[PDB]
Amino acid sequence: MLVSSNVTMQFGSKPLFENISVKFGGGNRYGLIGANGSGKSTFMKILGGDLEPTLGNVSLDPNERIGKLRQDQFAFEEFTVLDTVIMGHKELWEVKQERDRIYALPEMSEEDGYKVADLEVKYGEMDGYSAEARAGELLLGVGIPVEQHYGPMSEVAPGWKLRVLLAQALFADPDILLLDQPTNNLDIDTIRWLEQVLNERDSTMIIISHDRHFLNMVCTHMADLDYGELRVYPGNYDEYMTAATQARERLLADNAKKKAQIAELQSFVSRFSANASKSRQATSRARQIDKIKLEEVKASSRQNPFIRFEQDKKLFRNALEVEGLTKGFDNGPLFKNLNLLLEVGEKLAVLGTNGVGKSTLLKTLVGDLQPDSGTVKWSENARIGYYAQDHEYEFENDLTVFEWMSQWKQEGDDEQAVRSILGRLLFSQDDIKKPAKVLSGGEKGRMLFGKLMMQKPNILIMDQPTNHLDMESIESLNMALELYQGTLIFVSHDREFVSSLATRILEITPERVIDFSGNYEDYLRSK
Amino acid sequence: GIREKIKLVSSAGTGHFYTTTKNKRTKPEKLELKKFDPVVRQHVIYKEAK
RNA sequence: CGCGGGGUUGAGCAGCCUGGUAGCUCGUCGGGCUCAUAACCCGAAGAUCGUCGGUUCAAAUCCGGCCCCCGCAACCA
RNA sequence: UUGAGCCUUGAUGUGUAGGAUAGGUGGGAGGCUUUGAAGUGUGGACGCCAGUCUGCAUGGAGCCGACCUUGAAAUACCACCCUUUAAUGUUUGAUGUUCUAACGUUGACCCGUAAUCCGGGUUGCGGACAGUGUCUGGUGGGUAGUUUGACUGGGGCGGUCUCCUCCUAAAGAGUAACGGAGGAGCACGAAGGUUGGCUAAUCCUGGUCGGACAUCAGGAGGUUAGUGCAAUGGCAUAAGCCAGCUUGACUGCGAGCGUGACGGCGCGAGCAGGUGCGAAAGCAGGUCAUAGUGAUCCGGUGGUUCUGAAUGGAAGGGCCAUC
RNA sequence: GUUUAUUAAAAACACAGCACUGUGCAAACACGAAAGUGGACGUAUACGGUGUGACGCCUGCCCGGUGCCGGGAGGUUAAUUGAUGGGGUUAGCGCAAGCGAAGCUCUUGAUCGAAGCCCCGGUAAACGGCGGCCGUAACUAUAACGGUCCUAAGGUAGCGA
RNA sequence: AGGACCGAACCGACUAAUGUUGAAAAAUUAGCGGAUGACUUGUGGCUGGGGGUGAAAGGCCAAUCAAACCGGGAGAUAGCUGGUUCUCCCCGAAAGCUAUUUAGGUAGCGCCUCGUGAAUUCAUCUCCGGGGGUAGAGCACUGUUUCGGCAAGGGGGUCAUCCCGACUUACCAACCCGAUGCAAACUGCGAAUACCGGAGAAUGUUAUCACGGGAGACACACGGCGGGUGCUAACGUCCGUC
RNA sequence: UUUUGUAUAAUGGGUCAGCGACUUAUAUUCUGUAGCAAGGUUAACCGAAUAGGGGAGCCGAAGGGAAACCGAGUCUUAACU
RNA sequence: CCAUAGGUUAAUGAGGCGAACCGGGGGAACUGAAACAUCUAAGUACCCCGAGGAAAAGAAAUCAACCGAGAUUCCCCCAG
RNA sequence: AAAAUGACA
Ligand SMILES: Nc1ncnc2c1ncn2[C@@H]1O[C@H](COP(=O)(O)OP(=O)(O)OP(=O)(O)O)[C@@H](O)[C@H]1O
Ligand SMILES: Nc1ncnc2c1ncn2[C@@H]1O[C@H](COP(=O)(O)OP(=O)(O)OP(=O)(O)O)[C@@H](O)[C@H]1O
Ligand SMILES: [Mg+2]
Ligand SMILES: [Mg+2]
Ligand SMILES: [Mg+2]
Ligand SMILES: [Mg+2]
Ligand SMILES: [Mg+2]
Ligand SMILES: [Mg+2]
Ligand SMILES: [Mg+2]
Ligand SMILES: [Mg+2]
Ligand SMILES: [Mg+2]
Ligand SMILES: [Mg+2]
Ligand SMILES: [Mg+2]
Ligand SMILES: [Mg+2]
Ligand SMILES: [Mg+2]
Ligand SMILES: [Mg+2]
Ligand SMILES: [Mg+2]
Ligand SMILES: [Mg+2]
Ligand SMILES: [Mg+2]
Ligand SMILES: [Mg+2]
Ligand SMILES: [Mg+2]
Ligand SMILES: [Mg+2]
Ligand SMILES: [Mg+2]
Ligand SMILES: [Mg+2]
Ligand SMILES: [Mg+2]
Ligand SMILES: [Mg+2]
Ligand SMILES: [Mg+2]
Ligand SMILES: [Mg+2]
Ligand SMILES: [Mg+2]
Ligand SMILES: [Mg+2]
Ligand SMILES: [Mg+2]
Ligand SMILES: [Mg+2]
Ligand SMILES: [Mg+2]
Ligand SMILES: [Mg+2]
Ligand SMILES: [Mg+2]
Ligand SMILES: [Mg+2]
Ligand SMILES: [Mg+2]
Ligand SMILES: [Mg+2]
Ligand SMILES: [Mg+2]
Ligand SMILES: [Mg+2]
Ligand SMILES: [Mg+2]
Ligand SMILES: [Mg+2]
Ligand SMILES: [Mg+2]
Ligand SMILES: [Mg+2]
Ligand SMILES: [Mg+2]
Ligand SMILES: [Mg+2]
Ligand SMILES: [Mg+2]
Ligand SMILES: [Mg+2]
Ligand SMILES: [Mg+2]
Ligand SMILES: [Mg+2]
Ligand SMILES: [Mg+2]
Ligand SMILES: [Mg+2]
Ligand SMILES: [Mg+2]
Ligand SMILES: [Mg+2]
Ligand code: NA
Ligand code: NA
């Protein structure tokens, strides 16, 4: 029955959203959208109350429950699946860890005497004695099979990893700050599943995804944060699209009315100024110009990064040579033989529902995971560029934005010709003097597009490129690969990116891996 | 201009602050100087605030 | 030498919009179609962004001076 | 017709693992059943579809419970409530049709009356609409009160209005003009403090790319360089150039002066308390100095019993810091 | 025909004629703090406001701006309603700081909330508007013609020192 | 028949003269337009002051109209003009600075006057201790400038005009050397006066300072000297000093 | 009269006679003089009423501080040479 | 229909004038702020209604302050 | 669907 309040935040130069003043409450789900690298994730991170803003407008509601799914979908490879879901209850988790230091403590103290009783009575009061079982039924209820309940999250497919992480959020909370960009789970089947779960649950939830269609079926209000602040536009998404791109147009027309009215008062002032009979009237509109004050126009953060990949040697005959792969981790092998040939092109969109091993195919196609195969036989002068599905080991050791980008080069100069490439994809002068690990989402992805700019990889992979991009970098990336000369073997989950971009399909289903149907406008047409 | 006003609130618990200016665009991190607190009559640390 | 606006490829124009790619329509040229010329199809050429400086890693773009063009003003008893 | 709240009753609510679609608290293991049963057929409704379920006589009198995998026991039992839900009433909102009884009638007829006013009566038509009162949003030169700067080689236009540097300024200070020339509305957590150390521009010769001009080695020169920012004065004991440690860019005061009609502005040895650098003598109360800035009222934030309109509090003031 | 009695008698005002627009009658509109009157003892072939001004040939393009008319989907929005959160006081709990029921209070303000405006169309005998640069025809000149930029549209018929 | 035609009564007012302390606070004379119509006229009514009426001029509303007349608020306010009345004695200015919705007003100080209280307090001259950067001068610096010598270097042409540049020029020409000038914003030099401080005699009805009562004034003018501006023009204009 | 300045050809006045412009009330400050003097003095009012009662009250003898408060001291400051 | 409205008659009272004072219903602006709009001038000028020799007010749901005073009205202080 | 033109002798 309560609502949230206002905040204001800044991570350095040019503060971000500058005195937001909004309220979220009721049952309506405020779909929060915005360009890459602008508020959004960190705006509602403040809303969760774990970190406080700079200007400190404060937004308090400390009585009810908040459950938050975040963007770091791989932030726990260690905790078992049952532990991650239980940890969604913050009070239960922190109590248990200090309680669990019983069998790990060989000697007990006097003050520990009632302390262990004090923690145990709190455990029973919030009934932690059923948390493992309470989560298990819910965990089974979202589609995770029993046999992987006790397994580690390292050995769970990222598409499945969202189903666990949504179960963590759903812990009887009447609001959820969903950072859910349904990146990995875009099977349409799983997407359609997540649309039913959220729609038929009554909560004052917030959704942040970039999927235009997904926001239609679920969200009722939109909270675009584009120029310097967030404005709430009711309507789904395409009733929004008119107003947001019309209120801008009506401002440019109003702004250009004054700029054309001033320029016509300057006709009188510049003509009848020295005149003795008309001077008192020209100085009546010479001081009327000084009272118009046309309102300033700010630039939208929804810019279009300009990326293009160019070759270095351009092999001519063919790239791939796979005889028989027969790779399986701990169950029935995900593929049997997979005889493959690329023939210098054939952008080879790998497909399939999540959890069938398309990412483990690419990982062993590049030679990281050793298969029981007989080698993959790269070409004579292949320069492989890799964009892994998960990319977090690269962004470590606290290098800066300029530092991280700099080492990747072969002949270009260190000061210029890498600032331009790094700055071409929307990195301002003050944005490159901060650690490269503090970047967020699309900027992490945009770095790996820039990484292949200077590298000039003759052969490309791009495991899952269109994950966190902001619907404009996707249009740029789709255009960048379209005129690309060379070979790339990508696996994408959405339809339009695969359909428009050149393709030679290789779908993976147990057990036969269907190879080739042409345009992917015919692959579905054959069905 | 681009230089705005801050206050260094003491750490000795008492309410005392030296007010200065600091450029935020170049450096967005806090300021830590050991200054004099006349309320307790000692040199203590003054973390930036406001 | 008082005040505004402008100088970009052969012509007419964007791009200056908060600095990271020299672009549109005609035009010239070389092929093709045709008996031949137009129309049309394919391919390429040219610009020191008026000049000279100044912060910039980086300037058509930001600042300063000069040149050239187009307007307007230089009042009433 | 449809939303919202309230009461009453009845229904209502698993996978993991089983004899089973068990909500929570644990009081208890004996209730239940014939104020007609076990099973039988017969129908709703609900139903992560097996079942709960209750109108139904007949059949007529045994079923349940403990145990059993379980994180937990069991419609075996009752109570105190929870979830979702239907029915009554229950108070209210929204809309739609109707109704007369407020109200309107500048429709008709009768009377006061020898009266196209007014009042009363009968009736017809509208009918909770219209209209009026208080409050309120929009529009409102229809109307009213007023404003619309100064210097100025007459007035207007142009220029200017506060601060800093040089000349005019007549070798102390000051000194005007719409006199001649340029700048400011900042910057710096180091570009401040201290200790240690260092000395430039420009030329010649010789030297791979290398070039009138990069970096290097010698010699002449002497500060013609440098100073975050315009100009003047200054600077080798460097105030210019490097590095180590640091916060004195600190709190309360301040003899004595300088400059202003005042408001004010500036310099300052030294005293008290606590720091920094150095072995120590000592230096340090911002920066080589001069521009980088606006009084009072009104209000905002923090601290502090100073006051607190009978008393105890408090609101509100005061003082200190600050916007 | 009328007009500045007392320096202007006119090209000014009026006019018959034309058009737009309002008004269904207790008409619009006007004088009235109101009752009431005029409009009119008239009823859309009537009445009021605005502009043009006999008669003849005619009255071109522009709805972007400002007005007026229509639309109701959506955004913003007053009074009214007072859900929540914070403070003041204190019965009590402690014979420490401190905490704080009920009530009374100060304040914040969830929900309901029309016209208007934003938005979508129309209207110019509604107020108003109606373009540049470059090249080109057998001597010269000029462009019937072409390119391009912009605009809501670029001044047509007629007339022209 | 006609808002028809010519034309007296009647209604008007187009031209000229006179008149202008008039016969008249708009008329007389000679001509002039309408004169059966939207005409003219007698008597009586109605509309009133931000209102009336207006064939529309801001016209008329009692010789008064961009808001009538009378009385009242009322002795509105006037930083603006004018005026300010008997006598003698003593002293005796300013027309400047600063600020100003300020510039012809005012406020504080400077200048005047009256009273009180104080120091060889103050003024002139001689001697002593001082800091200048003006006049003048000078060209080491900042600029500028003319000669003469050397000459970097930038050009001009001659070659296979491919390289090395191999030969040339009637060229210009920076830095230094010698000579010659100029400067408010130049100074390796630098007065006279003025100013500040100290000591000393004489002279001066305290002439000096502080406080307190009362002001006026803040429009200046010409002349000499040093200047800015102007034309080294103005009884021009802005400063310093007399 | 107004001015830097007037015979000024800048204002005013034809002459005479009469009238015509710094006042009154209540407060505050300074000077002179008179009374009393660490004290001075009443107002309204009563009053056979310019006497006499009336000391309500005002000024002064003590200041400092925003204030509580302290007091020939007091404020600032943790404290002042 | 009763009755009311209306009509006539009789008795009583009022009407209008007046200088100031008094209570009530309305209520400006010039002016000052060195302009002006909050404010001031001012509840003043003026208009209207009513009454008396006087008129209004008047007998605490008032003050004070842990001591007390005792309706209303007028004058001097408190006090600029 | 688009399809213009061709000096005398
Ligand atoms: N710790 C930080 N401190 C200061 N500024 C930060 C910090 N972290 C991020 N930023 C800045 O804030 C920006 C916004 O980051 P944020 O996490 O909000 O991403 P986002 O806009 O939600 O992006 P995406 O849509 O890709 O998830 C970053 O690009 C960076 O410039
Ligand atoms: N290290 C591992 N140990 C055990 N099982 C693994 C391991 N890695 C992958 N798997 C399993 O094998 C399959 C391979 O999945 P993988 O992680 O390669 O991604 P994917 O199937 O392509 O999924 P998505 O489309 O969601 O990215 C999955 O079923 C996953 O659970
Ligand atoms: Mg007006
Ligand atoms: Mg007035
Ligand atoms: Mg003036
Ligand atoms: Mg001097
Ligand atoms: Mg001098
Ligand atoms: Mg002077
Ligand atoms: Mg420095
Ligand atoms: Mg040193
Ligand atoms: Mg230093
Ligand atoms: Mg300096
Ligand atoms: Mg009290
Ligand atoms: Mg306070
Ligand atoms: Mg006529
Ligand atoms: Mg006339
Ligand atoms: Mg006339
Ligand atoms: Mg009528
Ligand atoms: Mg006309
Ligand atoms: Mg027209
Ligand atoms: Mg006639
Ligand atoms: Mg007439
Ligand atoms: Mg006549
Ligand atoms: Mg006629
Ligand atoms: Mg006639
Ligand atoms: Mg008459
Ligand atoms: Mg008259
Ligand atoms: Mg008037
Ligand atoms: Mg008056
Ligand atoms: Mg008068
Ligand atoms: Mg006046
Ligand atoms: Mg004398
Ligand atoms: Mg004046
Ligand atoms: Mg000289
Ligand atoms: Mg003056
Ligand atoms: Mg003067
Ligand atoms: Mg003078
Ligand atoms: Mg003169
Ligand atoms: Mg004089
Ligand atoms: Mg004169
Ligand atoms: Mg004379
Ligand atoms: Mg003369
Ligand atoms: Mg004479
Ligand atoms: Mg005279
Ligand atoms: Mg005169
Ligand atoms: Mg005279
Ligand atoms: Mg007299
Ligand atoms: Mg005292
Ligand atoms: Mg009477
Ligand atoms: Mg005034
Ligand atoms: Mg005045
Ligand atoms: Mg009485
Ligand atoms: Mg008592
Ligand atoms: Mg042709
Ligand atoms: Na994010
Ligand atoms: Na994968």
Side-chain angles (χ1 to χ4, degrees), chain A residues 1-229 231-320 322-402 404-506 508-514 516-527, chain B:
Chain A
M1 91 185 58
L2 256 51
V3 317
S4 302
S5 316
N6 63 335
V7 278
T8 310
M9 171 45 98
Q10 156 195 7
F11 317 104
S13 310
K14 210 190 312 180
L16 274 188
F17 32 98
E18 302 208 289
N19 85 9
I20 293 296
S21 96
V22 295
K23 73 164 281 280
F24 306 111
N28 36 297
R29 25 200 68 95
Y30 300 87
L32 158 69
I33 85 177
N36 257 335
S38 63
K40 272 189 308 171
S41 196
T42 199
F43 162 74
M44 90 210 160
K45 204 177 293 305
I46 281 151
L47 288 205
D50 38 346
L51 77 94
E52 52 208 311
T54 85
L55 250 193
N57 272 317
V58 202
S59 60
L60 199 64
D61 38 24
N63 36 297
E64 57 241 42
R65 304 250 337 273
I66 273 178
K68 53 172 81 93
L69 163 60
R70 47 204 67 129
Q71 189 141 53
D72 222 9
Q73 229 162 252
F74 308 105
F76 29 67
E77 312 275 309
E78 315 86 22
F79 310 120
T80 179
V81 178
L82 221 42
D83 276 5
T84 84
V85 185
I86 292 184
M87 102 159 54
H89 196 152
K90 195 44 64 207
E91 295 94 23
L92 210 156
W93 193 243
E94 60 163 340
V95 154
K96 212 205 49 173
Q97 308 304 80
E98 289 293 328
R99 177 202 92 126
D100 252 357
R101 297 188 299 102
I102 283 168
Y103 274 30
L105 264 187
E107 37 94 9
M108 279 50 88
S109 93
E110 285 171 300
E111 301 201 309
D112 183 36
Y114 323 118
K115 262 198 184 304
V116 66
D118 184 19
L119 277 200
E120 213 77 14
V121 63
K122 261 151 72 84
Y123 208 77
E125 192 206 287
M126 61 175 98
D127 63 284
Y129 298 146
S130 79
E132 327 88 274
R134 201 151 33 75
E137 317 294 344
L138 173 94
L139 188 39
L140 182 145
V142 297
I144 283 281
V146 170
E147 273 288 81
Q148 304 147 5
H149 270 38
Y150 276 128
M153 201 85 98
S154 151
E155 324 194 6
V156 185
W160 291 129
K161 206 161 319 206
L162 191 136
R163 298 194 143 189
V164 191
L165 259 188
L166 182 102
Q168 152 167 124
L170 309 166
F171 214 80
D173 36 356
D175 47 44
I176 48 184
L177 325 170
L178 284 185
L179 193 31
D180 165 43
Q181 326 225 349
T183 40
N184 315 97
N185 65 320
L186 264 154
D187 303 358
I188 311 134
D189 293 327
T190 311
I191 272 283
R192 277 195 289 248
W193 168 82
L194 193 42
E195 292 185 10
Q196 319 303 327
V197 152
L198 297 190
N199 268 288
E200 277 129 23
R201 179 155 151 81
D202 51 331
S203 274
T204 170
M205 60 190 21
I206 302 161
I207 316 189
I208 214 181
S209 162
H210 286 109
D211 188 351
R212 160 173 18 101
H213 322 97
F214 174 65
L215 299 178
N216 296 9
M217 271 66 78
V218 199
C219 319
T220 71
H221 296 171
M222 300 297 218
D224 195 0
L225 172 142
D226 199 336
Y227 301 93
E229 76 278 47
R231 294 191 261 280
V232 178
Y233 310 82
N236 39 5
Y237 186 86
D238 305 27
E239 290 307 275
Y240 160 100
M241 211 99 79
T242 40
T245 73
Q246 145 190 297
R248 170 73 164 201
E249 292 289 293
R250 100 169 201 76
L251 170 132
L252 281 195
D254 166 280
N255 216 271
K257 224 217 290 190
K258 317 172 192 201
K259 209 151 84 83
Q261 153 181 359
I262 294 171
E264 93 179 23
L265 297 196
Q266 271 297 312
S267 279
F268 197 102
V269 173
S270 75
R271 210 188 144 176
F272 304 111
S273 197
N275 229 43
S277 66
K278 310 232 170 39
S279 77
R280 245 170 165 178
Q281 219 166 309
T283 195
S284 148
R285 40 203 84 198
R287 85 162 53 110
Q288 194 185 328
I289 294 170
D290 307 358
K291 303 209 269 163
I292 271 169
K293 297 307 160 201
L294 75 171
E295 60 264 40
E296 81 206 90
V297 157
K298 258 174 297 194
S300 306
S301 199
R302 286 163 199 281
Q303 303 286 78
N304 231 331
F306 176 85
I307 68 193
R308 258 108 188 111
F309 305 112
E310 318 235 12
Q311 272 161 309
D312 60 52
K313 189 161 175 43
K314 183 211 189 187
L315 51 152
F316 267 80
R317 267 68 150 191
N318 42 26
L320 259 303
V322 197
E323 282 79 348
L325 264 189
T326 172
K327 167 55 152 303
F329 275 128
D330 307 70
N331 233 43
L334 308 119
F335 27 83
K336 168 63 46 196
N337 276 14
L338 189 101
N339 280 285
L340 218 66
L341 277 148
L342 204 59
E343 196 97 54
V344 74
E346 276 79 355
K347 322 221 157 137
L348 182 43
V350 196
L351 303 174
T353 78
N354 45 30
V356 310
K358 45 207 97 66
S359 83
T360 198
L361 160 72
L362 259 57
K363 208 133 39 190
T364 189
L365 215 51
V366 82
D368 281 57
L369 322 182
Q370 315 309 128
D372 322 68
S373 88
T375 321
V376 277
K377 269 296 298 300
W378 281 132
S379 212
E380 258 308 318
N381 309 105
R383 194 123 73 107
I384 302 103
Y386 196 31
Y387 181 109
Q389 184 165 4
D390 79 335
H391 40 282
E392 204 64 3
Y393 55 85
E394 284 136 22
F395 309 110
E396 206 59 31
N397 86 92
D398 56 86
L399 278 175
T400 56
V401 163
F402 187 32
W404 185 94
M405 182 55 98
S406 201
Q407 55 252 43
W408 301 115
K409 70 183 157 304
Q410 67 287 53
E411 272 88 73
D413 55 292
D414 197 316
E415 184 83 349
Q416 205 214 296
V418 81
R419 196 83 44 104
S420 52
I421 280 166
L422 157 75
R424 221 198 311 186
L425 51 100
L426 315 183
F427 270 119
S428 65
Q429 305 189 191
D430 45 70
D431 280 32
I432 62 138
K433 304 168 60 210
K434 68 167 165 314
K437 106 173 204 308
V438 80
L439 283 199
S440 97
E443 318 165 282
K444 301 246 202 48
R446 234 139 65 194
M447 271 295 198
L448 282 151
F449 302 134
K451 205 271 209 173
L452 324 163
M453 223 80 88
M454 325 147 293
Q455 218 173 260
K456 308 168 181 52
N458 173 351
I459 174 187
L460 205 43
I461 292 272
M462 303 289 240
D463 195 334
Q464 188 129 22
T466 165
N467 249 1
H468 315 260
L469 307 188
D470 52 300
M471 183 259 218
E472 285 102 20
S473 315
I474 295 161
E475 303 166 348
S476 201
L477 185 60
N478 193 2
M479 217 151 56
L481 301 177
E482 187 82 57
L483 84 173
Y484 180 46
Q485 294 135 17
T487 89
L488 55 97
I489 308 119
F490 75 108
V491 54
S492 196
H493 262 117
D494 73 328
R495 173 151 148 180
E496 186 59 39
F497 191 73
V498 170
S499 312
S500 153
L501 205 162
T503 316
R504 158 183 144 159
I505 303 123
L506 170 88
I508 300 190
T509 187
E511 184 91 316
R512 54 171 321 191
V513 291
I514 298 100
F516 198 21
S517 153
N519 196 275
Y520 192 67
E521 185 247 315
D522 310 301
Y523 194 28
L524 308 189
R525 178 52 173 220
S526 87
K527 311 293 138 258
Chain B
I2 207 181
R3 216 160 169 88
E4 311 285 20
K5 281 161 272 192
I6 71 187
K7 44 203 270 276
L8 323 173
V9 179
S10 166
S11 38
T14 179
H16 193 281
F17 60 98
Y18 293 77
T19 169
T20 51
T21 87
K22 141 160 167 279
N23 190 356
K24 274 158 213 81
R25 269 70 198 275
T26 88
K27 43 147 46 190
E29 71 279 350
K30 307 292 131 192
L31 212 76
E32 302 247 12
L33 298 148
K34 259 186 49 189
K35 311 208 67 80
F36 186 74
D37 194 301
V39 172
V40 314
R41 306 239 310 285
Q42 282 313 130
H43 268 77
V44 288
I45 302 182
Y46 276 76
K47 288 197 287 323
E48 179 212 303
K50 219 192 214 152

